[PDB]
Each structure stands twice: as structure tokens, then as C-alpha cells.
Amino acid sequence: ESADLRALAKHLYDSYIKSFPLTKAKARAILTGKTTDKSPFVIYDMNSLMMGEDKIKEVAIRIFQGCQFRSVEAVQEITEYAKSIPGFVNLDLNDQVTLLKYGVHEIIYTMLASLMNKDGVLISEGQGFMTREFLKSLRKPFGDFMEPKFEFAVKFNALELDDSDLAIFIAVIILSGDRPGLLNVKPIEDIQDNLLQALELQLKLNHPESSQLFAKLLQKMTDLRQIVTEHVQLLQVIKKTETDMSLHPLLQEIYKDL
Ligand SMILES: *c1ccc([N+](=O)[O-])cc1C(=O)Nc1ccc(C(N)=O)cc1
Ligand SMILES: CCCCCCCCC(=O)O
């Protein structure tokens, strides 16, 4: 019944709003100049960077650590959203951990796109805006850290998803079931099947003139999978380049053996 899928969609959107404080709708209002929201301070060089902590350890490292800790914050919100996905907390505890371990970066980036346009990314819960060129201008290893996220976000944002779409899409991601190590795959797939049904109906209702958006959105799951695997290699590069730099353990466990 369509009715139960709508209720699932409504449930997930509600928990998404409750777990993610900077929605795509707010981020768009911030990025496009709307009077519901206030203007970000735009970091685009070192000096504007050094005025940012007024208004909102070398430069590239300082930024990379803020990105690092800003990532843990996202994992916490994602983990809290996950708990609301019906059936998730009833799964084998070890499979929960595995679903999160693998899903978290594909969801963090997917929701991260909401904060991006081709020019840069919202930072410090939308109060800041660090330009894409300033990030690309950073020293050798960190200079290329965020570029592939921007490239993805540009293509992803072209789908023009709203938060109510993303809430279901993100749940679909978490409940994959093709994740390595999963002890009991069938109840995960039963959940994902319901979510995908929910996602599909949601996209047809919310984007009726958007042909095959459902298919096109699932295909984007390929780009996410690429980003995450690409992202871990540059992590290993920096751990060996900067012996002195400390990756958060919560994040370390995410990359442990992929
Ligand atoms: C930055 C630097 C390092 C890592 N990492 O080793 O996992 C991750 C990041 C990163 O993506 N940080 C981030 C993600 C999402 C947001 C957000 N949605 O606001 C902020 C920062
Ligand atoms: C999106 C919040 C991040 C705060 C500033 C830290 C830099 C992270 C980034 O470049 O995305």
C-alpha cells in the first residue's frame, strides 16, 4: 500500500530533521541569498581564514583537523538518524556496526553535497563558506582532499533532491546488505526493499516530471562508493606524511580494513 510507504517517508523525513541541524533547505537558503537565513563569512584565502575565527600548526593541517572533527559530528548525527530507521536497531548488533562503518561516509558525503555548490562549501553550521579554490590551493596532500567531493556534489546537486528525498535515500544507503562482513543479510534486505519502495514512491510524487530519477539516484550510489574508497588512500598518505597528526579514533575505526 502506497499509504504505508508515505508514512515511512514521513517518518524518515521527520527523524532526518530531528537529527541533522543543517538541512539542505537551510543550506540552500544560506547559499542563494534568502532572508530566512543569514550570510556566511567567506573564507577564500589565508587572511579571510584568519578573520574567520573572529567572526565564526600550519594552515592546511588546521583546516584538515576542523574537517576531521566536523566529520565525527556528522557520524554522530548519522548514527542517530540510523537508529530511527525502522528495523535498524533490532538487527544483529554486529551488523548494525557493519552497516554504519560502511554507510557512514557514503551518507556523510551524500548529505555533504547539500552544503556545496560549484564554488565552495558551507562550514561551521552554515556560518562560514570556504571556497573550493582555497581548498584546492592547500599543500600537496590536503590540496586535493575535497575536490572529488565537490565534483560529486555538482553532479549530485543537479538531481535537485530535497531533504525529504534525501532522508529516504540515506536510509536506503545504510541498509545495504551487500556490505562486507554482514552476518544476517536477509533482514537488512527486507528493510532496504521497503525503503527503496518508499524512495521510489517519494521521488514519483515529489518529482513527477523527473524521468527515471529513482534509477538516476541509485546510479549515483556508484559515485559515492568511488569517493569513499578514493578518500581512504589519501588518508593513508597523510598518516605517513605527518607522523604528528592525529586521526580521530571514531574515524579510524571507520577505515579499519575498509
Ligand atoms: C574532512 C577531513 C577528513 C575526513 N576524514 O578523514 O573522514 C573527513 C572530512 C569531512 O568530510 N568533514 C566534514 C564532513 C561533513 C560536514 C558537514 N555535513 O557539515 C562537515 C565536515
Ligand atoms: C562543514 C563544516 C566544516 C567546518 C570547517 C572545517 C573544514 C571542513 C571542510 O572543508 O568541509
UniProtKB/Swiss-Prot annotation:
GO biological process: BMP signaling pathway; cell differentiation; cell fate commitment; cell maturation; cellular response to hypoxia; cellular response to insulin stimulus; cellular response to low-density lipoprotein particle stimulus; epithelial cell differentiation
Keywords: Activator, Biological rhythms, Cytoplasm, Diabetes mellitus, Disease variant, DNA-binding, Glycoprotein, Isopeptide bond, Metal-binding, Nucleus, Obesity, Phosphoprotein, Receptor, Transcription, Transcription regulation, Ubl conjugation, Zinc, Zinc-finger
Regulation: PDPK1 activates its transcriptional activity independently of its kinase activity.
Resulting phenotype, residue 70 to H: In colon cancer; sporadic; somatic mutation; partial loss of ligand-binding
Subcellular location: Nucleus; Cytoplasm
Annotated GO CC locations: chromatin; cytosol; intracellular membrane-bounded organelle; nucleoplasm; nucleus; receptor complex; RNA polymerase II transcription regulator complex
Induction entry: (Microbial infection) Expression increases when incubated with M.tuberculosis or its lipoprotein LpqH; induction is TLR2-dependent (at protein level).
One annotated GO molecular function: DNA-binding transcription activator activity, RNA polymerase II-specific
Residues included from the entire protein: 235 to 504 of 505
Processing after translation: Phosphorylated in basal conditions and dephosphorylated when treated with the ligand. May be dephosphorylated by PPP5C. Ubiquitinated by E3 ubiquitin-protein ligase complex containing FBXO9; leading to proteasomal degradation. Ubiquitinated at Lys-18 by TRIM55 leading to proteasomal degradation. Ubiquitinated by E3 ubiquitin-protein ligase STUB1/CHIP; leading to proteasomal degradation.
Domain of life where this protein originates: Eukaryota
Residues binding rosiglitazone: 68-71, 105, 231, 255
TM annotation in the entry: none
Implicated disorder: Defects in PPARG can lead to type 2 insulin-resistant diabetes and hyptertension. PPARG mutations may be associated with colon cancer. Obesity: A condition characterized by an increase of body weight beyond the limitation of skeletal and physical requirements, as the result of excessive accumulation of body fat.
Domains: entry comment: The 9aaTAD motif is a transactivation domain present in a large number of yeast and animal transcription factors.
Claim: Lipoprotein is one of the keywords in the record: no
Gene: PPARG
Primary location group: nucleus
Keyword Transit peptide appears in the UniProt entry: no
Motif interval(s): 9aaTAD: 249-257
Region listing for Interaction with FAM120B, in residue ranges: 1-46
Occurrences of domain NR LBD (ranges): 4-257
Protein name: Peroxisome proliferator-activated receptor gamma
Role description: Nuclear receptor that binds peroxisome proliferators such as hypolipidemic drugs and fatty acids. Once activated by a ligand, the nuclear receptor binds to DNA specific PPAR response elements (PPRE) and modulates the transcription of its target genes, such as acyl-CoA oxidase. It therefore controls the peroxisomal beta-oxidation pathway of fatty acids. Key regulator of adipocyte differentiation and glucose homeostasis. ARF6 acts as a key regulator of the tissue-specific adipocyte P2 (aP2) enhancer.
